[PDB]
């Protein structure tokens with residue numbers, strides 16, 4: 053199992069997508085035309101996971117860039133690594149989505165979807181052995197929120213035995229103040245719970261609060277938030293991209309991290325935003341979580357930890373045992389050995405030592421409740437439904453979407469209260 | 474004749490085959506390209522080393538073995554590594570996609586795509602054999618390929634080769650080096666489905682080996698390379714009775730007669746000595762009494778259990794090197810008076826001894842000292858049921874909530890298989906308790 | 914004694930054959946139960962996805978037939 057097919061959908065999807073590709077290209081020694089100017093063989097060893105090999109030793113991202121609004125094509129192409137993307141994989145619709153989910157999922161996205169699916173098939177057929185699909189998008193907008201989740205459901209039908217990853221950007225009043233973002237997210241979440249195997253909750257409220265309090269910024273741009281999201285996206289793909297004694301792919305991740313099919317919402321964390329015990333304490337700290345939850349208000353079902361840099365592997369073992377010992381109550385006792393640890397020698401650009409953290413915590417229900425509450429404030433007085441019922445939707449579908457997400461919260465709560473005896 | 478075919482399954486199986494076959498080549502003076510200067514009979518022969526190696530007409534000595542994995546990365550390193558010329562390309566077998574830490578995919582979904590090919594190749598080796606003794610199967614308990622493909626293979630081997638003997642060297646999972654949360658499920662499923670088809674099974678506890686590397690070899694954080702080098706030494710001690718001539722050499726099957734009192738009780742505890750660094754072995758010759766005594770120190774065991782709080786049903790000593798019966802007998806006399814050794818009332822209490830004159834060897838650039846003499850004890854103790862118990866408890870914690878069970882059911886398994894397997898292990902734990910109870 | 918000597922070897926053959934038989938049959942049993950189960954899981958997954966396509970047809974025919 054080698055090749056992953058990346059899909060960036062909507063504005064959020066395409067900007068965090070571009071950053072992701074800028075960083076990992078830098079980490080693999082790839083420049084904007086797409087040559088290899090590196091030095092280390094480890095950079096090339098599993099380059100196949102994200103790149104195709106064209107003539108003249110030219111490495112080309114396996115990315116599929118999708119939006120209903122053009123100009124997001126222009127910005128991506130005028131950006132640092134815009135030259136590197138494959139020209140035919142840009143699949144940009146006409147009239148845009150204007151922050152409506154029913155336009156993304158039911159009408160306007162429904163036409164463009166087939167011409168995306170053609171780029172997907174072209175990319176999937178040239179895969180020796182395809183593992184799955186990662187979709188970067190947001191859940192607040194229209195295209196990425198709604199077309200993104202139709203693509204998911206349509207890719208699922210042609211490739212139902214392949215893994216479906218999402219980097220799902222969750223919306224917050226502090227970053228964007230569009231009013232219907234709690235509708236769009238709750239509709240998306242009702243799709244995600246059924247059709248993805250694993251979703252990383254990158255969350256705008258957490259990213260704002262980090263940018264503000266940790267990084268000092270008094271009012272931050274999108275570019276500031278995305279410096280974080282790219283650092284995370286670099287970290288939770290390290291075990292896919294570099295060799296290591298561990299072999300690591302999207303299914304092995306899913307099997308080991310997801311104890312119940314519906315509880316596939318991960319809380320990521322990065323550190324720093326320096327020594328091994330401090331790294332280890334920082335990454336289990338609620339300030340370093342890219343979702344806006346507190347580990348100490350629930351329990352970890354499972355954790356992956358990834359350390360990058362030259363460091364004593366003995367020291368890392370002793371520390372990871374340490375935080376499990378000192379924080380024993382915040383892991384469920386009925387899953388043994390539920391915190392694992394990898395180490396890549398090669399650190400990221402800038403830092404000499406990093407540590408990235410993937411947690412499936414039952415405290416992720418704090419995120420689904422904050423969304424649920426902003427949603428329920430609107431829906432119970434039918435606000436802004438002409439946007440949705442106008443494109444054809446029923447009211448039923450809002451009740452189901454709301455109820456499904458409350459079940460998800462209730463189930464996260466059930467396994468938090470569970471006991472070994 | 475008396476040929477023995479080795480089958481190496483999944484990463485652990487493969488990487489331990491490297492350690493083993495590298496070691497056997499050094500033990501018999503076989504060069505990387507497969508040539509053996511000291512073999513005057515070119516093309517074939519009847520020599521003791523021919524139980525593990527066929528000869529070609531060109532003078533190549535070729536392992537009677539097959540490496541099998543459902544993904545190419547581990548076997549690709551055998552294809553391009555120091556010993557790439559030793560193996561015929563058809564012995565090294567790979568798929569495109571792994572079992573993903575799932576017994577089900579290893580047994581059914583990915584596994585049934587490659588199984589006929591694997592048996593076809595095993596068959597090609599079996600037909601180079603004038604009197605095939607049986608198979609040696611190397612695999613992890615915890616992997617998806619190691620657990621599920623091995624189970625499928627063992628089932629199929631019982632069909633193609635009847636009652637022809639099958640030995641397992643099984644890697645038992647440990648948290649220090651564990652790769653998957655679901656290892657306890659895989660372990661209990663493979664153990665269950667393999668138990669009627671295996672004749673003897675040497676468990677190796679990764680933790681036990683991990684502890685030995687830290688404690689005795691001064692290794693701060695042992696890798697797989699460190700563990701496999703130690704394991705290959707133990708494997709070598711056990712197979713050395715098959716690979717060497719000797720006046721005092723007792724064959725491995727004769728030990729098996731003593732080691733297996735009922736079909737299900739076929740899990741011997743191994744213990745190896747001396748494991749010592751060069752630094753510590755310098756000006757420090759270890760006598761027969763010291764290494765024999767070290768066999769009853771439970772820190773030297775391959776599985777973490779306590780034989781002292783259990784009962785022996787057999788005790789075999791496999792010595793290699795500068796050892797003569799006199800020293801062995803004196804050493805055993807000392808141990809009987811000074812140590813905690815209680816047999817069940819239905820076994821005779823005699824220790825069965827075997828001796829190979831070929832002293833043990835070391836792989837270049839390793840951590841073990843070259844020593845003049847060495848010993849592997851194979852005991853059948855009820856204590857080893859402790860290992861089943863620990864693992865069965867981890868299984869029960871998860872199975873009570875159905876954690877991860879959907880990943881197995883989605884690939885076609887039913888809940889029935891899980892509980893059927895767990896009850897078999899419940900019965901096995903009860904069997905190991907029964908044999909220890911005194912008669913009336 | 915000679916007739917007993919033939920009964921014992923016939924028994925040894927019989928039981929060896931029986932093991933090979935019931936292992937062969939037990940195995941074919943499981944592989945067939947599994948394939949039916951795996952296929953039934955994927956058939957249900959695809960039938961839930963084809964039930965969405967058919968709900969998307971109702972929403973696209975509520976915009977076109979409400980104007």
Ligand SMILES: Nc1nc2c(ncn2[C@@H]2O[C@H](COP(=O)(O)OP(=O)(O)OP(=O)(O)O)[C@@H](O)[C@H]2O)c(=O)[nH]1
Pocket residue numbers: 061062063064065067068120121148149150151152190191192193194195196197221222223224227228233256259274275277278281
């Ligand atoms: N973290 C982060 N969030 C972003 C970025 N760009 C947009 N967003 C968020 O995206 C959400 C809105 O979705 P967009 O991706 O802009 O919209 P879209 O899904 O493309 O839909 P349309 O613009 O309606 O076609 C809001 O919550 C924004 O704050 C970004 O670069 N980084």
Ligand SMILES: Nc1nc2c(ncn2[C@@H]2O[C@H](COP(=O)(O)OP(=O)(O)OP(=O)(O)O)[C@@H](O)[C@H]2O)c(=O)[nH]1
Pocket residue numbers: 482483484485486488489542543571572573574575579613614615616617618619620644645646647650651652656679697698700701
């Ligand atoms: N002693 C030892 N143990 C190993 C080695 N490689 C992996 N393991 C252990 O084996 C278990 C994992 O099984 P693997 O053999 O890697 O898995 P696999 O059989 O290749 O199965 P998949 O990779 O899931 O198809 C864990 O307990 C590992 O610590 C090795 O070289 N030596």
Ligand SMILES: COc1ccc(CNc2c(-c3ccccc3O)nc3ccc(F)cn23)cc1
Pocket residue numbers: 288289290291292298300301302304305308309354355356357358389390391392393394410651652653654
């Ligand atoms: C209980 O937790 C796990 C068990 C197995 C896996 C699969 N592979 C994997 C991963 C991993 C896999 C895919 C993508 C990103 C990743 O970071 N990271 C680790 C770290 C340690 C380790 F032992 C395995 N890891 C994941 C988690």
Ligand SMILES: [Ca+2]
Pocket residue numbers: 512513514515516517518519520528
């Ligand atoms: Ca010869």
Ligand SMILES: [Mg+2]
Pocket residue numbers: 062063119121148149195
């Ligand atoms: Mg847009």
Ligand SMILES: [Mg+2]
Pocket residue numbers: 483484544571616618
């Ligand atoms: Mg493997």
